[PDB]
Amino acid sequence: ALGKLQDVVNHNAQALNTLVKQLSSKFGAISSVLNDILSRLDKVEAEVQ
Amino acid sequence: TLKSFTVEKGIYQTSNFRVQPTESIVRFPNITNLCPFHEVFNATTFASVYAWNRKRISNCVADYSVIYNFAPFFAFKCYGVSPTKLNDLCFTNVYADSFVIRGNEVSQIAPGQTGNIADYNYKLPDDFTGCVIAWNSNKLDSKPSGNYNYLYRLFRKSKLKPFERDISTEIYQAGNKPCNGVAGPNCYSPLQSYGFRPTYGVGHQPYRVVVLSFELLHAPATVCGPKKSTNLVKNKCVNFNFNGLTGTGVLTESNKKFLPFQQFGRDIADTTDAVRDPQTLEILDITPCSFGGVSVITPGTNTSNQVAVLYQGVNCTEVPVNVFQTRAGCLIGAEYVNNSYECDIPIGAGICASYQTQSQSIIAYTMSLGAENSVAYSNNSIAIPTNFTISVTTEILPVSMTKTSVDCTMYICGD
Amino acid sequence: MSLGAENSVAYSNNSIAIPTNFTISVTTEILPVSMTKTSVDCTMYICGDSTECSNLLLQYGSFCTQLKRALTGIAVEQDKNTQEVFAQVKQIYKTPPIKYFGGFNFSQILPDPSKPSKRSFIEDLLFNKVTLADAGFIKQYGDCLGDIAARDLICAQKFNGLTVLPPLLTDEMIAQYTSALLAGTITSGWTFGAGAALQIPFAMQMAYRFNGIGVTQNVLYENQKLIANQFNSAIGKIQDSLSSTASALGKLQDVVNHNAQALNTLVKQLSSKFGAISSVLNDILSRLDKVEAEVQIDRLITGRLQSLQTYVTQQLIRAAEIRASANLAATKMSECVLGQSKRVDF
Amino acid sequence: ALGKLQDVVNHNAQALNTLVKQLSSKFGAISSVLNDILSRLDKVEAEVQIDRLITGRLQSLQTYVTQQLIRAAEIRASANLAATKMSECVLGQSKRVDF
Amino acid sequence: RTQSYTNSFTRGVYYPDKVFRSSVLHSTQDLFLPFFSNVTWFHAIHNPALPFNDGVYFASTEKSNIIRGWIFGTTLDSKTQSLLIVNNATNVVIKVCEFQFCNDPFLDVYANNCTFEYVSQPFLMKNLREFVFKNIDGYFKIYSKHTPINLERDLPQGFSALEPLVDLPIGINITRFQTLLALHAAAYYVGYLQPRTFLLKYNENGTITDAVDCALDPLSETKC
């Protein structure tokens, strides 16, 4: 009966969940956690990734 | 522009017009002396790694194409600049730090580097705009007993700051032994020298690393020289080589109050707006000359082939790289008429054009807002119609476009 | 926060309320119609004058062709918005020699030939309140050539390819459209929106516009002087508010500020490195090698192309909003200027 | 008279044709064909060039989807106007003047 | 010595770079004096030193004009390039040497390695003189501004933005510093310089107008 507001809430929630899950994407780098890159690579390769 | 062969009746944007630069000017400060790039390179010995010497170079010919064969090395580890166009620049000062290190930390001489010998004897800034010239010393500095002259620090209570020299001798107190001046057990001094041999290993043979400071875009410049200075012109589109800045301008004269220490000037977006002349201290604004674009006013290709040309928002005193002038710009190829027709092609701010015979010509005119009316009004003036017209007027509205589904893998990658 | 009033309606079985008096109030609604028609050259912004940046921008295909097509469509859309909002009439009407328009004082809104422009008093106050940026619709390059005082912001916008195209309808012919609409509204009324002008005295038109809201037309024909003086005092209140209380022109001054700050942000983005060593392109040609230089030039091209695409996308969304507001303004001019509207709170 | 629907058809056709022509763009890579890149290059450097082409065609696809979303909002506004005109010009008589 | 406490006010502003800007709102990260800091007087008749917390802001209101240096270094006794800014009526004698200065270096009115020997014009001449010093990235800088003061009470509300006087090509780590005596009865100020950021206003002539301590107030951080 209330479909459009459920679509609004689900669209906002899935947009924020997609934004959260996009932290896990590598985007061509070696990892997705900045602490592991900053404690694994020297500053030239660290700034590249 | 239309990527076709038939052209509809209308006004079409075309690529911009610019005034070509006429001359090229070079204004360098009159410096004629020479400085020893050579004599600091074939020297008898260099300073220690913890006691690296920094020397100031000013007022000499800045020749970087000769240090290729003043020293037997293998290319440059340049950051920020390049050795190919290094002689075309003009900056304030250069400092040549030099020291003799082991071979397996030439890669440790870099901005943002952490190691034993990266932080205890010599440290670079986070953004180092210079070159890290390095070469072997297998013949010049090699002893059968060992190179005990050079010293490197093993122990320090804190890491070094960038570009700062810590020359001292003391006793490290990592242990609990209170020797307080004795170099015996458990409080060993950090004065230890690495030793090599002529028959030693090849992977970390000693080096002769020389760095360059290269501070630029600041202060009066005094280490420049290797080109010919020319004259200077005003109010003409020319290329300028004011110190290191390159561009096209007219070089007008203005009234800007220079402080005695300032040598540049930027307006908003790091674009240089006023350059002090290095020879004589005066005013020189920088302004690239006239520009805009061209708009083609044409009828259909099946109708005619003549064109009318707009120049966007500029007085057409300099047209190339009749004439009707408006606030949108001049028109070459169009003739003004004092009449008022329902206009087909909009031209600019207030003016239109059409295609009339009165051979056919491309006329341009001020826009007719319709036929002017002088509709009557009094206390007794009313129009009531005695007849009608049941008219069918066609109105067209889009509803939906084409449903397109794009396969992302097939389009981007192609199986 | 107060939610406005703790009022209670006095409902009963048969509780009623009817008004014994009115207030002819000239409510002022301010609407944007067209924004600033700009166009980006994609050679003076991204590259300035370099052949190398032009050759690398040639590798990106039809990006700036699509950008120029989108900006040309935006400018043509703004001209279409101006034409479909203002030019609702086919023939320009002229004012009669007598200015007694049924007792209603129209001297503030009808134009006068004292000033060289054909504008009006209230239109002059409305142009003086909105601090226009004085963009490239006037040929300011004669002023930008001479370095008077300090360097201007519009000269910095113009010198980096962010030129501003003038509107097709200038302010004089837009004022002629407005004066023709006013003369057709006073002399012909609502009947010029259905063909040609059909003359009417202004008292009859105000009577036949009272008939459209369920009010009989004896109300003005017993109280013409009171309604005329209320209209005069209300337009005097509007005139005094435009003179002193500058708290009503926020929409159009906001639109001018959005356009000016958008061009200023797009200019100031030329000082951003986007990960390169510097933002001065000529120093990048003068300092670096070949290969490393087109590497850093490609970084600047990606950064400035992303900035230009953000500018074009934001201008497309803003053009959609401006086109919605212009469709609303065209619906108002078609509906409540060329006639009388029965929609509530419209 | 039928300029609007012909404009809509030409808009969608030229959008798809521009998306097809965008496949020939290099985007700074050494070529524009994925099989050509995977045929001559190594593994890591072809991963670099394919990532460059992926970024270029992803920017092109994002521009295409964003432009189609703005055009679909415009088409939805025109379709809401057409549904309103079916509701009160066809299914009734509208008193809105110049409508 | 007597350490009277008051406000340092909006002083200590220096030119961050030598680029001539007009009507430009510019912000940058520099190590210098924040707004509304503390004040330590040193008026007495009489040598203990002060710690160098990355910069000192100075202000002398001497009509007799008797000050001949600001000695820096690590342990202050002929160890790391003891700076002497002794000035006579003809020139200035700015040198770094090792002359074994132990305690109480007073100068009457009537060695080792010396790398620097540069001599310039006399900078020192109802007057106020500011001498903001700084050590960043192994560099040493001297600043000067001869603003004529009106009231001989404390630091006024006037603006005395510092122009860069002399930039040194060499530098050493600075920990301990003091002020040279001048006898045959004086009063000066010492401030502490902690890293915050500018918000500079330039007028039509390019002179530096009022700045804003962005890390002092929420209003000022809103302004920045």
Ligand SMILES: *[C@@H]1O[C@H](CO)[C@@H](O[C@@H]2O[C@H](CO)[C@@H](O)[C@H](O)[C@H]2NC(C)=O)[C@H](O)[C@H]1NC(C)=O
């Ligand atoms: C209103 O206009 C119509 C035409 O638009 C008139 O119809 C014409 O009438 C005359 C004689 O009555 C005929 O000869 C014409 O052939 C008619 N025209 C058409 C197109 O059929 C009509 O007469 C007009 N009304 C009045 C009252 O004069």
Ligand SMILES: *[C@@H]1O[C@H](CO)[C@@H](O[C@@H]2O[C@H](CO)[C@@H](O)[C@H](O)[C@H]2NC(C)=O)[C@H](O)[C@H]1NC(C)=O
């Ligand atoms: C209806 O309201 C109007 C104002 O909205 C009244 O007009 C005012 O009446 C007072 C009476 O003392 C005058 O002093 C004012 O000058 C009038 N204002 C004008 C003419 O603008 C009007 O009187 C009210 N109607 C009735 C019947 O009282």
Ligand SMILES: *[C@@H]1O[C@H](CO)[C@@H](O)[C@H](O)[C@H]1NC(C)=O
């Ligand atoms: C450079 O030229 C100027 C003007 O001719 C002159 O005053 C100055 O002494 C010259 N400098 C040198 C080092 O010759």
Ligand SMILES: *[C@@H]1O[C@H](CO)[C@@H](O)[C@H](O)[C@H]1NC(C)=O
């Ligand atoms: C460097 O100096 C040595 C010592 O005098 C000399 O033998 C050598 O030839 C010099 N190098 C060059 C390139 O002249």
Ligand SMILES: *[C@@H]1O[C@H](CO)[C@@H](O)[C@H](O)[C@H]1NC(C)=O
């Ligand atoms: C530019 O055009 C205007 C208007 O035609 C004119 O007044 C002005 O003098 C022109 N500028 C020149 C010729 O430098």
Ligand SMILES: *[C@@H]1O[C@H](CO)[C@@H](O)[C@H](O)[C@H]1NC(C)=O
């Ligand atoms: C209405 O008629 C009177 C009669 O004298 C006249 O004075 C007045 O001007 C007329 N109004 C108009 C608008 O014609």
Ligand SMILES: *[C@@H]1O[C@H](CO)[C@@H](O)[C@H](O)[C@H]1NC(C)=O
């Ligand atoms: C009318 O209102 C009165 C309140 O005075 C109430 O008692 C009565 O029930 C109402 N009438 C009806 C029909 O409910």
Ligand SMILES: *[C@@H]1O[C@H](CO)[C@@H](O)[C@H](O)[C@H]1NC(C)=O
């Ligand atoms: C009202 O109209 C009269 C003449 O009809 C005119 O003199 C007067 O200036 C008008 N009022 C205003 C405020 O313009």
Ligand SMILES: *[C@@H]1O[C@H](CO)[C@@H](O)[C@H](O)[C@H]1NC(C)=O
């Ligand atoms: C300055 O410091 C003293 C003690 O060192 C302190 O009592 C005083 O409150 C300070 N002044 C301030 C914070 O304004």
Ligand SMILES: *[C@@H]1O[C@H](CO)[C@@H](O)[C@H](O)[C@H]1NC(C)=O
């Ligand atoms: C800029 O300097 C001139 C030089 O006389 C002066 O007249 C003007 O007032 C100054 N502008 C200021 C202080 O804003």
